[PDB]
Design brief:
Its main location: cytoplasm. The protein has no helices and five strands. The chain is an all-beta fold and about 70 residues long.
Length: about 70
């Protein structure tokens, strides 16, 4: 599991980016967010996650707030 923080997140639509030091930002969709409740993220939130890549390119998976 990779570590980063939320660069920004559009809570209305439910997407944004995780920034990772020395690496490309990673797109994150609300559907990747683990845990209970309304799936959202705040700018600056630490997260652990994986990067999953299919034909659409890499995005975050298994995102847990840290
Ligand atoms: Mg950067």
């Amino acid at each position: 599991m990779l570590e980063g923080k939320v660069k920004w997140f559009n809570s209305e639509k439910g997407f944004g980016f995780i920034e990772v030091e020395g690496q490309d930002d990673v797109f994150v969709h609300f559907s990747a967010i683990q845990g209970e409740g309304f799936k959202t993220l705040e700018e600056g939130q630490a997260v652990s996650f994986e990067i999953v890549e299919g034909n659409r390119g890499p995005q975050a998976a298994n995102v847990t707030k840290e």
